[PDB]
């Protein structure tokens, strides 16, 4: 009636908790992994970060930027849209390559002539080596990375374990190597071709890193967020139980006047 | 091709020796797609 | 440097124009009374005439 | 409000506050006066009793009559049948409630819950 209609819906609150509890237990199992994972790879990095730091710096332009496939996770993925549309004030029409299919529909609609490379199937994926690989061996062919002057990658940093806000590092370029303020402390003749093979590696290497980042950070807003979620579906909750049974003393009350009319006459 | 993908491939033959853990295999082995884009306009996926 | 001579010189003049016009249209208003009472009293005598 | 109506062509209004009120007092007669009472507690002599005073605020060719009325709602229920049988015999409402006074909204008129025949 009234009655059922109460009922259903104090269901539905509570099916959506339900779901939004397993959901944070399911997040903390996968959570642990993911900033193991983070630690190894930074790490990695690092060591070819205080290559390109010793020897200086030098870095249309490319956008790099990796968000879950999945919907759900927090506000990751249009805090993220926030800061590449921040950098896409230089050039409008500047070309983004999407790893993570969310972002793209969002950027689609901001300007048409950023997505040129997209990516599907990272979503439900670890930050691992093989997919980096792929996508920066492709990045080369397809988009001419090579050509840039500026790379630039974004991820959602996992500031603190209860946050994460959008953050970045630049790929850097072959032709910084060649110019930057010291060569000669990194002097070469022709013994190798260093920036042209160093710069490929370290595109694969850095934008990895910059997965497992956002990776640690998507999972761990998600548990939060989620977390959250419970919280006010459970307020819900508690209003619908006060509309329950003030729902159930109304239907008696109302009944005992049609029994007691009928029986006086 | 690239230098970083001939790295890669060195990696794959790493992956199997059958003692190695599920991760490791998954650092050397992913069944995806790359959707190609253009433009909007899109050319439809293919397996990365 | 001409540039900004020129804004002076043109602009000085030709606001002198509807300085006099919009003040013109404010003496209209005045003649526009007599409309209004013309109005006033017709539907007075109109409405007191539906009664009838 | 119909010797204004009738016998002179001057413009009429009419302000109500509450005719809820005139409903409340027939449910407090009823019982007393020899009928049996109807569920809820209001009239069984409902749709007659409410019947005369709304055809006795009509317009006529004598003379129009813009009324505004005003309608006390007994718990918030706004689905009893003495509010209910009332927006038949209306044109327009402006119903205010409970809900978008503790918003601040000032007004209280709800948005989403207001009508009118002079709406196309």
Same mark, same amino acid.
């Given at each position: 009636?009234?009655?059922?209609?109460?009922?259903?819906?104090?269901?539905?609150?509570?099916?959506?908790?339900?779901?939004?509890?397993?959901?944070?237990?399911?997040?903390?199992?996968? +959570?642990?992994?993911?900033?193991?994972?983070?630690?190894?790879?930074?790490?990695?990095?690092?060591?070819?970060?205080?290559?390109?730091?010793?020897?200086?710096?030098?870095?249309?332009?490319?956008?790099?930027?990796?968000?879950?496939?999945?919907?759900?996770?927090?506000?990751?993925?249009?805090?993220?849209?926030?800061?590449?549309?921040?950098?896409?004030?230089?050039?409008?029409?500047?070309?983004?390559?999407?790893?993570?299919?969310?972002?793209?529909?969002?950027?689609?609609?901001?300007?048409?002539?950023?997505?040129?490379?997209?990516?599907?199937?990272?979503?439900?994926?670890?930050?691992?080596?093989?997919?980096?690989? +792929?996508?920066?061996?492709?990045? +080369?062919?397809?988009?001419?990375?090579?050509?840039?002057?500026?790379?630039?990658?974004?991820?959602?940093?996992?500031?603190?374990?209860?946050?994460?806000?959008?953050?970045?590092?630049?790929?850097?370029?072959?032709?910084?190597?060649?110019?930057?303020?010291?060569?000669?402390?990194?002097?070469?003749?022709?013994?190798?071709?260093?920036?042209?093979?160093?710069?490929?590696?370290?595109?694969?290497?850095?934008?990895?890193?910059?997965?497992?980042?956002?990776?640690?950070?998507?999972?761990?807003?998600?548990?939060?967020?989620?977390?959250?979620?419970?919280?006010?579906?459970?307020?819900?909750?508690?209003?619908?139980?006060? +509309?329950?049974?003030?729902?159930?003393?109304?239907?008696?009350?109302?009944?005992?006047?049609?029994?007691?009319?009928?029986?006086?006459? | 091709?690239?230098?970083?993908?001939?790295?890669?491939?060195?990696?794959?033959?790493?992956?199997?020796?059958?003692?190695?853990?599920?991760?490791?295999?998954?650092?050397?082995?992913?069944?995806?797609?790359?959707?190609?884009?253009?433009?909007?306009?899109?050319?439809?996926?293919?397996?990365? | 440097?001409?540039?900004? &001579?020129?804004?002076?010189?043109? &602009?000085?003049?030709?606001?002198?124009?509807?300085?006099? &016009?919009?003040?013109?249209?404010?003496?209209?208003?005045?003649?526009?009374?007599?409309?209004?009472?013309?109005?006033?009293?017709?539907?007075?005598?109109?409405? &007191?005439?539906?009664?009838? | 409000?119909?010797?204004?109506?009738?016998?002179?062509?001057?413009?009429?209004?009419?302000?109500?506050?509450?005719?809820?009120?005139?409903?409340?007092?027939?449910?407090?007669?009823?019982?007393?006066?020899?009928?049996?009472?109807?569920?809820?507690?209001?009239?069984?002599?409902?749709?007659?009793?409410?019947?005369?005073?709304?055809?006795?605020?009509?317009?006529?060719?004598?003379?129009?009559?813009?009324?505004?009325?005003?309608?006390?709602?007994?718990?918030?229920?706004? !689905?009893?049948?003495?509010?209910? !049988?009332?927006?038949?015999?209306?044109?327009?409402?402006?119903?205010?409630?409970?809900?978008?006074?503790?918003?601040?909204?000032?007004?209280?008129?709800?948005?989403?819950?207001?009508?009118?025949?002079?709406?196309?």
């Amino acid at each position: 009636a009234t009655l059922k209609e109460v009922e259903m819906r104090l269901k539905s609150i509570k099916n959506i908790e339900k779901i939004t509890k397993t959901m944070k237990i399911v997040a903390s199992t996968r +959570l642990s992994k993911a900033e193991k994972a983070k630690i190894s790879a930074k790490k990695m990095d690092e060591a070819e970060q205080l290559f390109y730091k010793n020897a200086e710096t030098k870095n249309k332009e490319l956008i790099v930027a990796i968000t879950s496939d999945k919907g759900l996770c927090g506000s990751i993925h249009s805090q993220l849209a926030k800061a590449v549309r921040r950098h896409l004030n230089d050039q409008p029409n500047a070309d983004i390559v999407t790893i993570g299919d969310k972002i793209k529909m969002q950027l689609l609609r901001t300007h048409p002539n950023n997505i040129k490379l997209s990516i599907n199937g990272i979503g439900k994926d670890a930050p691992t080596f093989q997919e980096s690989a +792929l996508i920066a061996d492709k990045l +080369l062919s397809v988009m001419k990375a090579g050509t840039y002057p500026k790379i630039s990658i974004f991820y959602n940093d996992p500031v603190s374990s209860l946050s994460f806000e959008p953050s970045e590092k630049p790929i850097f370029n072959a032709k910084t190597i060649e110019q930057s303020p010291s060569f000669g402390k990194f002097e070469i003749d022709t013994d190798a071709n260093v920036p042209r093979d160093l710069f490929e590696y370290t595109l694969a290497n850095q934008m990895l890193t910059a997965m497992a980042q956002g990776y640690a950070a998507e999972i761990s807003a998600r548990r939060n967020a989620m977390d959250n979620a419970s919280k006010n579906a459970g307020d819900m909750i508690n209003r619908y139980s006060i +509309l329950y049974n003030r729902t159930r003393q109304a239907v008696i009350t109302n009944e005992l006047v049609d029994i007691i009319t009928g029986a006086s006459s | 091709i690239s230098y970083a993908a001939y790295l890669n491939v060195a990696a794959q033959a790493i992956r199997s020796t059958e003692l190695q853990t599920a991760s490791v295999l998954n650092r050397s082995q992913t069944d995806a797609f790359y959707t190609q884009y253009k433009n909007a306009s899109e050319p439809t996926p293919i397996t990365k | 440097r001409i540039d900004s &001579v020129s804004q002076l010189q043109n &602009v000085a003049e030709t606001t002198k124009v509807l300085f006099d &016009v919009s003040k013109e249209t404010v003496e209209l208003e005045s003649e526009a009374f007599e409309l209004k009472q013309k109005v006033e009293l017709a539907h007075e005598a109109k409405a &007191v005439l539906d009664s009838w | 409000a119909e010797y204004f109506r009738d016998e002179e062509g001057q413009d009429v209004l009419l302000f109500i506050d509450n005719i809820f009120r005139f409903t409340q007092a027939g449910s407090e007669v009823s019982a007393l006066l020899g009928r049996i009472p109807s569920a809820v507690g209001y009239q069984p002599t409902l749709a007659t009793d409410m019947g005369l005073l709304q055809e006795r605020i009509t317009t006529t060719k004598k003379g129009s009559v813009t009324s505004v009325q005003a309608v006390y709602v007994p718990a918030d229920d706004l !689905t009893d049948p003495a509010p209910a !049988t009332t927006f038949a015999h209306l044109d327009a409402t402006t119903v205010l409630s409970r809900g978008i006074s503790e918003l601040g909204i000032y007004p209280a008129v709800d948005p989403l819950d207001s009508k009118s025949r002079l709406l196309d």
